[PDB]
Design a protein around this nucleic acid. Structure first.
Ligand SMILES: [Mg+2]
Ligand SMILES: [Mg+2]
Ligand SMILES: [Mg+2]
Ligand SMILES: [Mg+2]
Ligand SMILES: [Mg+2]
Ligand SMILES: [Mg+2]
Ligand SMILES: [Mg+2]
Ligand SMILES: [Mg+2]
Ligand SMILES: [Mg+2]
Ligand SMILES: [Mg+2]
Ligand SMILES: [Mg+2]
Ligand SMILES: [Mg+2]
Ligand SMILES: [Mg+2]
Ligand SMILES: [Mg+2]
Ligand SMILES: [Mg+2]
Ligand SMILES: [Mg+2]
Ligand SMILES: [Mg+2]
Ligand SMILES: [Mg+2]
Ligand SMILES: [Mg+2]
Ligand SMILES: [Mg+2]
Ligand SMILES: [Mg+2]
Ligand SMILES: [Mg+2]
Ligand SMILES: [Mg+2]
Ligand SMILES: [Mg+2]
Ligand SMILES: [Mg+2]
Ligand SMILES: [Mg+2]
Ligand SMILES: [Mg+2]
Ligand SMILES: [Mg+2]
Ligand SMILES: [Mg+2]
Ligand SMILES: [Mg+2]
Ligand SMILES: [Mg+2]
Lengths: 206, 51
RNA sequence: UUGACUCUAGUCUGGCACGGUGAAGAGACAUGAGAAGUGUAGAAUAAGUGGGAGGCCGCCGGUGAAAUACCACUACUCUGAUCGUUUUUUCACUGACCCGGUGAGGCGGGGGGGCGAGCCGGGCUCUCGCUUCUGGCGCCAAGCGCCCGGCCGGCCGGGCGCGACCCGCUCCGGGGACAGUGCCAGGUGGGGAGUUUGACUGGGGCGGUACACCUGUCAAACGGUAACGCAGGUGUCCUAAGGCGA
RNA sequence: GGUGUUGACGCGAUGUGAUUUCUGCCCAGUGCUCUGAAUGUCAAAGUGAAGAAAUUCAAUGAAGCGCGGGUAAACGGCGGGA
RNA sequence: CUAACACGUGCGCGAGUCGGGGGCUACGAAAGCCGCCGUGGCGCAAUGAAGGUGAAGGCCGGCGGCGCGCCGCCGGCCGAG
RNA sequence: GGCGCGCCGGGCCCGGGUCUUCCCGGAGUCGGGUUGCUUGGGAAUGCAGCCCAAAGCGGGUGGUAAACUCCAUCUAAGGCU
RNA sequence: CGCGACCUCAGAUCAGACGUGGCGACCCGCUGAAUUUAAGCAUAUUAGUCAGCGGAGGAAAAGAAACUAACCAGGAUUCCCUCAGUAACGGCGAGUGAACAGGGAAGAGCCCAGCGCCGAAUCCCCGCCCCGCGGCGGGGCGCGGGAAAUGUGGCGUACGGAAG
RNA sequence: GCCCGGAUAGCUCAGCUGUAGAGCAUCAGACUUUUAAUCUGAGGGUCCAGGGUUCAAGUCCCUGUUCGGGCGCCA
């Protein structure tokens, strides 16, 4: 793909701030259409994007953790929910799915994904709602920031994708760098390269 | 042959498009190159027809 | 010579190119527009993914559900119609191409003139354009009009236009994107070419196979031993008719 | 290019051989010819699919063969036993 | 008669051999010479289709290993039916 | 005749290294398909007819057809000696 | 209607030139068989040979890589030794059959179009004068004629090159 | 072999998110002289086996048998 056309698209959205003069918090997205990839056949792709800007930024987090996380999570204002809290969380499958409605993505400690599949592994894998693992580096400082914006390209049976990258107030070369990394990662993730797409559309939210 | 190939890329039957160029030009490497060049030309026409 | 073998000029047919221009008919599509997306629960006719918290003056929560709800531009499928890409069928066009005629001699429009139709001197529609009693002659301009030249109104001698209408892009016609040629492909092809047409054998030929094998003899008590010698046999059959044991 | 400085009362290809009297029967065979619409058969190219491609596979379907008429002054043929 | 091959025979050299092609110095277009002109041919190595591989062994000492008296490997010795 | 010397006239008023900025290529040809001939050239070595008929980090070659991918090596379709 | 530029196209016993034909041993282009061999014969073999046709020179053709290789890489063509009667082709039968690498003979490299930049800076022909003239050339003079912008000459060619 | 098509109760056939339907058959009841026929009703499938998408699929797609249909072989 040419890049001066992406410069044209980002100038037309930064001066299509004229086109809406948006009234909420502002963000854009890119859309992908693909040519003859049969969705019911094999080679189904589901890959995560390693991205270096966090284009969401209003990103909603609660974690699931063991101890060593208490004082640091409450110092950085992040909900540490230990196993007795998880018992109260496990006694009903109705409210635990509505806090995933509150909270955008999760992340959990190393051994608590042995206690989440009791009944509630299959209980709330009914959202596409993976809780991501931590490490023995034991730092959620900047690791929450770099595990958010690891964006899931997912193949489901409709033949269209739409991934939220870009809020219109970041800097422009770094945002086209984000779109650059995302689209070449998708072209690599597909069964075949850049010929496999129809048209990439980066129009705004409203 | 280029106009009929651009029209097959417009309808997007790319396999028969490639077989068409390779039967009417020759080597499959040349066919891949001419299909990719006509897709680029057709993309420029789509951008110009957009704005 | 042919019903031999292998081919061949020729001929028949198909495809590709030369090879265009329209118009209808049948379509495949694309593009633009316009409506459908009722298993069940949920106030609900939720097709699907993703973004999203006050647009405009429904919502975010909460409810049921697996999955939600202003917005936007997306990607799916289906249904009537308009447009531009291709295929195909038919009807036409002339411009490549072919044929005929001639000393390529009046072609196509338009103007002017006359004979017939009818409406109120008028125009339209159409036709015509000068030769038919005779084995004659038929060109190389008459007449008209306008200019000009030599000599003294007169002489003598020139030029131009009508007469013989004007304007045009193929000379006229006749075919025509097929005839045809170039190259493939299949058919046909003693018209023509090249070649072959076993062997044994009481001459060859016809017969027979004594040409590959088998039994008994011939075969003269080891083995070997001939002829178109004798009498016969074979080009198979067997899931047991093979192998064990009783 | 010949026929052709020609045009069916001609050109070209055949058989039989003046005249008189006749010219019987057979289209099964081999030819030749006529029509293209059932199952058929059928090349190259063109089309559709699968596959990474070479390639493979399928449908389409020309003539000719088949199939169905005609023809013996076409090659030819025209019984036996009680 | 030329070429190719085989065998026998004479000659030189002998695990080598050969300068035939090239070069250097009347008969002589002969003859000689090269050697860092042996490039090369043939020979000294066979087998396999090919990847390839590519032509004696033993005895002594130390460390059933167990129901490699064999020995896996190291140091010495004999050493080529 | 050539190699030598000299005079007059004429022609040319020429180079190299470093840095910077530019620029660069041969088409009914290459290539593919098919047919025919030819070659040792074998899933086609060369040549030609017909049809299709290009590209520019391209194109050709890389002795088994083909796809993906590194490399290697040249620069055809112009010419003299 | 005429006059004039150009473009196409004629005509000349126009001015000046040029090709024709011969020989053909060696060379180049095309065409191109069959006896023969295979114990027959049809593919092959004879054979890209004999015949045929065109065209040259003192030599012709070839030739300065769209190469050979796959290595520690060589480096135009031609010719010789060798590769080799090998790889390879072939009713895999008869028969056919190269090349690279190595050693030698010889040794030489270059030039356009394009990309460009220079006031077409270029070329041909007529006349006059001087010189030489049996290879019609050198210099000057021409308000002498043409060619050429539909592109001549200078630099410049893949080994890069040009300008400052 | 090969795209191709199928499997649904003892037997044939319809059917994108569940009471698997329609008929023929078997079982029982009533009429009957009697299940000889009539009529009433039932029961009766692990949707060929498994995997996948899906909110769950007998249906949509893969995998594997199994059979149906011509081409491939052969003469
Ligand atoms: Mg025959
Ligand atoms: Mg014949
Ligand atoms: Mg004959
Ligand atoms: Mg005989
Ligand atoms: Mg005896
Ligand atoms: Mg027995
Ligand atoms: Mg007769
Ligand atoms: Mg008959
Ligand atoms: Mg000897
Ligand atoms: Mg030839
Ligand atoms: Mg040959
Ligand atoms: Mg390779
Ligand atoms: Mg050159
Ligand atoms: Mg050259
Ligand atoms: Mg003259
Ligand atoms: Mg001559
Ligand atoms: Mg012979
Ligand atoms: Mg003989
Ligand atoms: Mg003979
Ligand atoms: Mg030959
Ligand atoms: Mg030969
Ligand atoms: Mg000759
Ligand atoms: Mg001479
Ligand atoms: Mg020469
Ligand atoms: Mg060169
Ligand atoms: Mg060489
Ligand atoms: Mg040898
Ligand atoms: Mg043989
Ligand atoms: Mg060499
Ligand atoms: Mg030397
Ligand atoms: Mg120049």
């Amino acid at each position: 793909v040419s890049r001066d056309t992406l410069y044209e698209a980002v100038r037309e959205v930064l001066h299509g701030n004229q086109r809406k003069r948006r009234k909420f918090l502002e963000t854009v997205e890119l859309q992908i259409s693909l040519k003859n990839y049969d969705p019911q056949k094999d080679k189904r792709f589901s890959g995560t994007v390693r991205l270096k800007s966090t284009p969401r930024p209003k990103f909603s987090v609660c974690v699931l953790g063991d101890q060593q996380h208490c004082d640091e999570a409450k110092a950085v204002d992040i909900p540490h929910m230990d196993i007795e809290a998880l018992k109260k969380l496990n006694k009903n499958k109705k409210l635990v799915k509505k806090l995933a409605k509150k909270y955008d993505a999760f992340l959990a400690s190393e051994s608590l994904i042995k206690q989440i599949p009791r009944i509630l592994g299959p209980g709330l894998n009914k959202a596409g709602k993976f809780p991501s693992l931590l490490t023995h580096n034991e730092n959620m400082v900047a690791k929450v920031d770099e595990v958010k914006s690891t964006i899931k390209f997912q193949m489901k049976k409709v033949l269209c994708l739409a991934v939220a990258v870009g809020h219109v107030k970041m800097t422009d070369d770094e945002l086209v760098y984000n779109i650059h990394l995302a689209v070449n990662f998708l072209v690599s993730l597909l069964k075949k390269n850049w010929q496999n797409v129809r048209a990439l559309y980066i129009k705004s939210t409203m | 042959y280029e106009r009929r190939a651009m029209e097959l890329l417009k309808v997007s039957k790319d396999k028969r498009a490639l077989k068409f160029i390779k039967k009417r030009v020759g080597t499959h490497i040349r066919a891949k190159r001419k299909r990719e060049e006509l897709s680029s030309v057709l993309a420029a026409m789509r951008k110009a027809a957009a704005k």
